[PDB]
Structure 1
């Protein structure tokens, strides 16, 4: 039986800027670094950055919607978004759905998100206003 997400691994083209982005800009804790990767944590999340020469710096129009959302409190959301904006971090989408969301890109074009709200919150909103074809289980 699967019990949760064990780790997220992102392939990166250049280890130093990726470590700077996740550790210094985003505030994640750096636990270890080696010649070809790093381990960070963000709350319960175990993040691995893996140096990979196959990683392309990928414009957002050229990647699909796969993306990784980090939790933040509503109270902290706006100042963290403003931090990313000051740093010149690119946005790939505007929010049009429930709960605050900020859609931003990492140095290699990985699609990230800041989101406020849980699955329970989303399901409650969907029960009240179901998407087209929505069925609950």
Structure 2
């Protein structure tokens, strides 16, 4: 039986700017670094950055919707978004769903999101206003 997400690994083209982005800009804790990667944590999340020459710096129009959302409180959301904006971090989508969301790109074009709200909150909103074809289990 699977019990959760064990780790998220992102392939990166240049390790130093990716470590700067996740540790310094995004505030994650750096636990270890080696010649070809790094381990960070963000709350319960174990993040691995893996240096990979096959990673392309990918424009958002050229990647699919796969993305990674990090939790933040409503109270902290606006100042964190403003920090990313000050740093010139690109946005790949505007929010049109329930719960605050800020959609931003990492240095290699990995699609990231800041989101406020749980699955339970999303399901409660969907029960009141179901998406087209929606069934609950």
Q: The TM-score by the shorter chain falls in which range?
A: over 0.9
RMSD: 0.1
Q: Secondary structure at the match of 2:30?
A: strand
How far, CA to CA, are the matches of 2:22 and 2:43 in structure 1?
13
1:28-66: CA deviations, max 9, x gaps?
000000000000000000000000000000000000000
Q: d(CA) in 1 for partners of 2:53 and 2:10?
A: 12
Q: CA deviation at 1:7?
A: 0.0
SS at match of 1:57: coil
**SS of structure 2 residue aligned to 1:130:** coil
**Equivalent residues, number:** 137
Stretches (4+) displaced over 4 A = none
Q: Distance in 2 between matches of 1:114 and 1:126?
A: 20
TM-score by length of 1: 1.00
User: Structure 1 stretches of 5 or more lacking a match?
Assistant: none
Partners of 2:130 and 2:43 in 1: how far apart? 31
Structure 2: gaps (5+ residues): none
CA distance in 2 between partners of 1:113 and 1:130 (Å): 23
Question: Aligned to 2:104, what secondary structure does the other structure show?
Answer: strand
SS of structure 2 residue aligned to 1:38:
strand
Could you say what secondary structure the match of 1:22 adopts? helix
Structure 1 residue 130, shift from structure 2 partner: 0.1
